[PDB]
Amino acid sequence: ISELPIPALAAWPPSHLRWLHEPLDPVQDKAWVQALPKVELHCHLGGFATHGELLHKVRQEAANPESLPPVRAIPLPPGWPIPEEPIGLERYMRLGDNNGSALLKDPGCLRAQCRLLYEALLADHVAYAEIRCSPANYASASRSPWVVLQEIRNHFQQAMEETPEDRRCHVNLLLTATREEGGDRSRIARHLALAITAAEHWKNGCRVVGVDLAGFEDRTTRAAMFATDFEPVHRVGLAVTVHAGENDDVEGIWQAVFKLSARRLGHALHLSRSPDLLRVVAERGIAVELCPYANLQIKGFPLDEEQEGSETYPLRGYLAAGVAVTLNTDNLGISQASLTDNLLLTARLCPGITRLEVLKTQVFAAQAAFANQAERKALWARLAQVPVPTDTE
Amino acid sequence: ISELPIPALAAWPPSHLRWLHEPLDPVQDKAWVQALPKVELHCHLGGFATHGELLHKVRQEAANPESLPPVRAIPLPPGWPIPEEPIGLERYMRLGDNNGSALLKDPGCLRAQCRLLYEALLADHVAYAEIRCSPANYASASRSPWVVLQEIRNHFQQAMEETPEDRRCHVNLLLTATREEGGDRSRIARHLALAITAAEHWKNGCRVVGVDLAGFEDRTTRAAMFATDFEPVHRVGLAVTVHAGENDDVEGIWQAVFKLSARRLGHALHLSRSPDLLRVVAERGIAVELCPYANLQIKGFPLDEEQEGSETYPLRGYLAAGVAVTLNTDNLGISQASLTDNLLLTARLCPGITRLEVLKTQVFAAQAAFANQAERKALWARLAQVPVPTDTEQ
Amino acid sequence: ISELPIPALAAWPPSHLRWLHEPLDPVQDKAWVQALPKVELHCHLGGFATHGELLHKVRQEAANPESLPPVRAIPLPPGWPIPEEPIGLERYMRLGDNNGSALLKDPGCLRAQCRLLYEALLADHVAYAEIRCSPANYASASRSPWVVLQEIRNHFQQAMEETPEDRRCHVNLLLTATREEGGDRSRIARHLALAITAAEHWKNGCRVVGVDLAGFEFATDFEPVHRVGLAVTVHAGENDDVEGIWQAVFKLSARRLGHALHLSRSPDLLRVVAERGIAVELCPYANLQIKGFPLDEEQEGSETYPLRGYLAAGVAVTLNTDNLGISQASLTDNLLLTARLCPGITRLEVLKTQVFAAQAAFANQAERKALWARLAQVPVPTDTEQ
Amino acid sequence: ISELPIPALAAWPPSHLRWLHEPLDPVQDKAWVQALPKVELHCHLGGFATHGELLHKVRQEAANPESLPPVRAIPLPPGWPIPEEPIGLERYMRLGDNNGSALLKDPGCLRAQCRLLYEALLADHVAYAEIRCSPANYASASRSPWVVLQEIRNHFQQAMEETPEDRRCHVNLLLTATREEGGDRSRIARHLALAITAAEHWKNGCRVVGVDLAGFEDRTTRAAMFATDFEPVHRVGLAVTVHAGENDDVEGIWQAVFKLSARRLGHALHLSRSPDLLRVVAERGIAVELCPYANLQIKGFPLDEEQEGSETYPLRGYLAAGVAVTLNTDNLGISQASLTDNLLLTARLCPGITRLEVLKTQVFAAQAAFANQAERKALWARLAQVPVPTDTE
Amino acid sequence: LLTATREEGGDRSRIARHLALAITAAEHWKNGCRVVGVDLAGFEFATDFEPVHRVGLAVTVHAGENDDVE
Amino acid sequence: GIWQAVFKLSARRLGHALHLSRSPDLLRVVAERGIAVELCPYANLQIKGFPLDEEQEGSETYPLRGYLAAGVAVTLNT
């Protein structure tokens, strides 16, 4: 019974302790997954309402109506949400363009984004979430990057107060730095000053808990990421999370762990190919952020297989290796899946996956989260509220 | 019309122009200096209402008039503000313990501090001021350093908008990297991060224009500050001023100019010892900001000497070497002297200083201010209104 | 129920769960701490038997009996498990000069030293131990530091195979690279290169798991160490700078801090050290004898022992013995004197220090599964009658 | 009379002041500009007698006439000095091949290049000149770079002492480190060491006032410059000037102002592209030295336009932004025109340029010059004799 | 040989002036008496002597007043 | 590269230093400090290629004799 992830999970009927050790079914477990207290660690604010009804619930709430960019017709590929072929990384980002930097440069639209994203998290029974936003991308002449960030924190804090304590998703903000750094260096340290300042203005509720180092994928940005002083952010308590991904550079992942002191690696899909890096990423406690739907639509993986293979999703191999893996959503709108759908899609990507393994990902996520001693004492008290199975056999 | 700093002093009557070249009279010219549109560059906000009737008025404005610390009795040296013998900076910095860290943590006391200070700036006819504040010292559990800073800016911004354009003193903010109390890399990283964010939150009115690198005296405070990357400060447009008082350390001034890229030197009273450093300061146009009363009280100088001596005030020596010298007040309350008084003391401190030297120091200050093109155009328009003399009869 | 660190403490009768939350008895619980499966993370090989009778046993079975330097004179301070006053560190080092570099720079003696130390670990019911050695300190003109290290590993490896698997104490080596503030810097280079080479040589049984740092309390010297999967632990004893623990965590990439008794001074270091999982190695007897702490106080003051404060803050605190012979106290004794130093320490906290050590050990996946299973069999209480 | 650059312009009658604010006429103002006390801050010694009669005058005074290189065929592009199309830097550099480090290696020819150049400076009524030379390029087996530098300084000093004080141009020397790509980084060390030695040797008359980083237009010598430790040249009182490379890079300029402590920038024609860099350059007081003819022939700009544009000469944009802009001649021989000719071209390159703008540029040059307190007090006394207009209406 | 002596927090201009003088004199004279190297009476500064090595000047370290192999 | 090897790697031998004569200062430093230049004739010919069976010393000729005449310690290897 010691193999169980949660201490409260041991004191169950013996039948359920055998059900949890049985492979998860992606069709009949939609109700059990839909009630699990979940943790979200890789969520982008810009890619939430990128098309559909949500894209018009935000545009109808704009402060000024006549300034919104006209809705362009971005054709979602066929087979979507599950494309028959990968669409690449560049096409994946371009899919969500009716939101982000063009729709949320408005007090009204940005408030519909924060408020609509919180209800979606509550609809998925998420107990903790680190939302990744770029305030510097949304700043107009009158709206400073601090004004934008100060409103995002206040909108989420307002949502967290109107809900009861037991149905309350605790939202924390990660500040991402990407895109513009390829043409300047002032922005890389202009964005690290917000985090240091934002990490001190607020001490309770919604807080800026870390700095998200997007742009670690490119090579010139990586030149400026190690050409920047990161000790000031380390002293102030901010944690560092990095985007790995298409660039399959083992040397890049090595520098982040030991030069930037990164505590989480995003989209580390090619980590098993280096056996020496896997151990270091497994003994030091580094948490890997995996996104099932967002990786199938950008890289492609075999679905509905029978036995493990050479191009299988690395979720199973990481768990055996001891790596602390976590399943996330990446882009709730640019993709079409909630945190429940992603957890269910890891039964057609990873053959033989156990239901208890789905619970371990929410225990690893509950330890990788950049929360304090108070936030992480109410998160574990909510993961112990896992619902009893509906079938049991 | 050969060597005239202000260009409005060219259609100047020859009788008055010759009067401009005569030595300044400390007692008679008090009325003329009082009407001069001056520039302030070294003014510590927390040393304004240190004692006297001004200290009390900051204390009935307290939002919570029960947590106010008691009034500690801090006697002044006899003969203040002109002490018989210099008291040193350690004793000097303790005279203003009734205001500062204790007090100014109440939101009401800070608002009175900012508004009362602005009133004293209009009384001296100051056209541009750069107040040095440390928001990290007035912060509490419910008041972060950013909240304190945003309150200080909005108190000065309101006062600016309530004044006519022709009689308005434009106030800017400098963030001070504190003395030996500072030096921790977790504290100098917070001070610079706040300055970078505040340098961009505001683009009109009262603004944050630079960081004051106090504690340069401490040898342990150095090399924690040379170990921090000041490049992001320079990229965002923040100017660096170094508070180089209370020693002759020639190898520290050399590194501030060329490593920290500092643009102003505070209390550089030993520049004449190193002629090589004096040429670099004069040629590169680094402004040396001198504080007459604060220097006389802290370290002492001869007064009313007939001829220039070895220990004489270096104000005229700096001017002869083409150094952009500026005269400031340092601490309005602790020193117990206004900007007008500081200019008049130069006659006693520096023998034979002409009335054109005083006007030159104000032109030097206008060039050394951390002001953008919009504020410079307004400051230059105010410096062209030189008051007409009254005693041009000898 | 979701507060015990092992999913086996929960499924007990109600009274046992109630006896754990009571303060640990430093007398009655002697028979129960002795039966606990402990984990040792701060043990020095050069201080096992520095005087007494075990000095003779190591001295008896040398291989060059005409070389053994004569026994010097070591006055133990008054009583000494527990000194009346601190003796300092530099004095504390010289309390064990009858054993170490001199005696162990002889093939026969070094066999006894590793053979006897493993004997002590078994008697204490230790399921895991990371021993610290300095092979370059035992080298001669015909016994290179590699030869010394290879002998040490096989002596521990031989003992492990001679003991049954149920009672086996898995031992791993931890090379100590000490910063000579006056001495030559080559021995820093030799030790690091020796650990980088030993990392790949052995993959089963006794292994060289990491490098220890007695000094710098060196950033560029440790980049190669991190490539080969070696974990660095930094001594943080004498001196009281925060900037040393601040550059050990983020420049040397340290994963364990030894004798860090002044973390509470800084309020940001405690959060960082308690949010990244950095473990603090504490030695009750060694810290008491070196620096001195109030004992038997009925309340927690300003100078009290920081174990309970660290535990409240979430810092992963382990309890160790540092030097066995020099301190003259076993792991159970160190685990019992903590009650005297820390008033109100519950007996579940003592169980907490062992779980934290299990997560702090430099063992691999296979090593951890044997260590975790062995910790599952927690001994049932004996004196539960009140 | 509150923004007049020169204090002596306030005493003018209030009828010429109206003329002073009118746009510069490049045809009717030839006589007025020719009598203006001018300042030359960018003038290469090796590109003066590159062709024409001046080349043969220099070639005729050689001490070793048998060693004179043959006069090669250098065809100037058609339409010179106003090329029909830009000819580029590399082609522009090769126009001055009949003069340079071929004739100047002869001690006799060096006198002609140094004494004829001074005679061309008095024709333009220049009150202060900063000639930049590379003594290491004219060295021989029996003539070290220090020997060449002594002759250059003493040839200009002799001419300076044979001219009246109210008619004498004060010539100062700048040493150029011309970026040998990798093969010779000892040339940079040799160049900087020569400047430091000469910075203390002479304290009166002609002096070595600074070092010219003409090699900043590269990528490996820019890296060589950025690791050269310019600290010693800063302690001996030497100023630093940097050639803003033809490559449109902003990261180089940011390091020239804050890492090399440069006090001037040469051909900084792309400062407006970064609005944050133009603000720092305008506030710190860095002087941008612009050559109209050298820029119109190398890069090419629209001429005689009736209004501004997206490709117009950046003189007006820099002046409006509060930047210290100076007009120079660069290579006075290769460009085939004088300082007076360059000033009148701004009426064609920059439409609407006023006659008070050219006066401002001379005031900017007088403040950007690397002169001491003695040479500056004599330069201002010469700039106060502004010639009275000959038209007035 | 030109001696570039580090001072106890004294002057730093002479350590650079002597190095520049040595670099110039190494190329100035090629017969008879010559400047053949620089003497370092301090640091016993690694970024201050790259120009010395790039020109072929030999350096001799003038150790003293200490017993340190470092 | 030959500069950083000598003065930053503290090299005592240089392998395949066929372009030493391009920098007279570097050649003089190598000769004076006694740094040995190890040359491989067949490997250099097969990789770089040099004229063969000439009668005089050309610009592209193999740099052995030039290095020996300059006082450099040259070694021939396989």
Ligand SMILES: Nc1ncnc2c1ncn2[C@@H]1O[C@H](COP(=O)(O)OP(=O)(O)OP(=O)(O)O)[C@@H](O)[C@H]1O
């Ligand atoms: N897979 C990825 N790889 C690299 N960068 C990514 C990736 N996914 C998101 N980003 C970065 O995340 C940043 C934040 O995206 P977000 O969804 O919050 O909207 P946004 O900033 O408005 O987007 P955009 O930059 O596309 O207009 C974007 O700048 C994008 O550069």
Ligand SMILES: Nc1ncnc2c1ncn2[C@@H]1O[C@H](COP(=O)(O)OP(=O)(O)OP(=O)(O)O)[C@@H](O)[C@H]1O
């Ligand atoms: N060297 C200095 N460093 C920092 N602040 C200074 C200094 N000299 C004067 N001050 C004033 O101190 C203010 C912040 O510090 P604080 O008000 O606590 O003063 P203090 O000198 O530390 O002591 P006190 O509060 O007793 O006056 C600054 O805004 C400035 O007004």
Ligand SMILES: Nc1ncnc2c1ncn2[C@@H]1O[C@H](COP(=O)(O)OP(=O)(O)OP(=O)(O)O)[C@@H](O)[C@H]1O
């Ligand atoms: N508790 C400690 N604190 C600091 N340094 C220590 C400590 N214990 C040992 N060292 C250092 O580690 C080395 C000794 O390690 P070890 O105890 O394994 O061998 P030893 O037999 O005691 O050696 P030696 O006789 O050379 O001291 C020496 O550098 C000693 O300074």
Ligand SMILES: Nc1ncnc2c1ncn2[C@@H]1O[C@H](COP(=O)(O)OP(=O)(O)OP(=O)(O)O)[C@@H](O)[C@H]1O
């Ligand atoms: N416009 C320019 N941009 C960049 N570098 C330049 C420019 N003009 C000249 N230089 C550099 O200045 C160096 C010295 O120029 P100068 O005219 O004084 O010498 P020179 O005798 O003409 O030299 P050379 O024969 O090598 O061209 C030239 O070698 C060239 O490297």
Ligand SMILES: [Mg+2]
């Ligand atoms: Mg010992």
Ligand SMILES: [Mg+2]
């Ligand atoms: Mg030429």
Ligand SMILES: [Zn+2]
């Ligand atoms: Zn992300």
Ligand SMILES: [Zn+2]
């Ligand atoms: Zn001050």
Ligand SMILES: [Zn+2]
């Ligand atoms: Zn040039």
